[PDB]
């Protein structure tokens, strides 16, 4: 999966603001973190839509 290794290589975790972030394959904790406090933040804040 070269084309892939490149995609991430270039792309990769890229963000400019907690709210504005870009999660990629290399998500892992990085994502979970930002992910939690980034998009899902406002989202749920707008309508968690059930818990757990």
Curated annotation (Swiss-Prot):
GO cellular component: troponin complex
GO molecular function: actin binding
Keyword Acetylation attributed: yes
A biological process from GO: cardiac muscle contraction
Acetylation as UniProt keyword: yes
Record key words, sorted: Acetylation, Actin-binding, Muscle protein
Post-translational modification: The N-terminus is blocked.
Purpose: Troponin I is the inhibitory subunit of troponin, the thin filament regulatory complex which confers calcium-sensitivity to striated muscle actomyosin ATPase activity.
The family this protein is said to belong to: Belongs to the troponin I family.
Subunit: Binds to actin and tropomyosin.
Descriptive protein name: Troponin I, fast skeletal muscle
Protein species of origin: Gallus gallus (Chicken)
